[PDB]
Subunit: 117 residues, 3 copies
């Protein structure tokens, strides 16, 4: 799974263990090995949400599966709870987009996931 | 809707009201409330387009609906016109990608849009 | 085609000709004109992959076609080989996501690709 977190919170306010916690949250929620999770953090970013500059996190999550409607409720709940705790964000300032990719459309280790299976 | 604008124009040359104008443009074009629009601006970025470093904007727009082929022509026209005016970009230096998401695949306020409906 | 490369390698370690080489690689692999390829490089980024901070590249590639399963193996191989050479990355530290867009969902030159055809 590949995650991008963009936030207007300053990078020094995003704790150094945030990525590791998010890795662990999504490994459990998505049933995926920690070894195949990437987290990108773009903090101190220029973001407007709902017309204001209040702290916000805009998150994108890509995965091969584990993205049924029901799964995505669980992910939303878990990711949001982490952001509440670690980023001091209200739930209405955590936006997540979910992309379910075919293994034919993910490259890793020099070939697609589909070709390595 | 969630928008990411990456540009090699310096951040001080992207006017402070750009995001608000883009918010308003897309609220009208997409028939969506301003309260549910996020704009991320990554300016001063390292971009090459068509082999050159000339000023350019690469934009991604995600939305739940409002992305028929006809809708996306209108969005392109409107977004491009804003970038022409505010970013001093020719139209051939404004590239936009449109992603139409299921409400099952957007999290907001601690659950999916689908679960909140 | 539109490419985003995020890496935790420092920007001064990403050679200035990286984007041009990647442009050329994908023009050949995807059979697309150099004039319609954008490369965004977000270097010096905060990334965790597999729980560690080792150098890594997380890449997103969008295209109108040229993204059959077989095509994406070739792209993965070629892009990975470039990153091995230019970024000093092992193949298991190059992750790529492939998005195949409709021409109705790409704006360029003030209208969609579909409307310009």
């Amino acid at each position: 799974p590949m995650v991008k977190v963009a936030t207007n919170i300053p990078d020094k306010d995003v704790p150094a263990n945030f990525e590791e916690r998010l890795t662990d949250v999504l490994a459990e929620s998505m049933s995926k090995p920690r070894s195949r999770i990437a987290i990108e953090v773009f903090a101190g970013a220029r973001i407007l949400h709902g017309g204001v500059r209040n702290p916000v996190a805009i998150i994108k999550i890509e995965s091969i599966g584990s993205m049924t409607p029901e799964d995505n409720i669980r992910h939303t709940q878990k990711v949001t709870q982490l952001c509440q705790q670690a980023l001091n964000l209200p739930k209405e300032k955590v936006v997540i987009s979910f992309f379910d990719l075919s293994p034919t459309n993910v490259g890793f280790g020099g070939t697609t996931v589909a070709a390595a299976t």
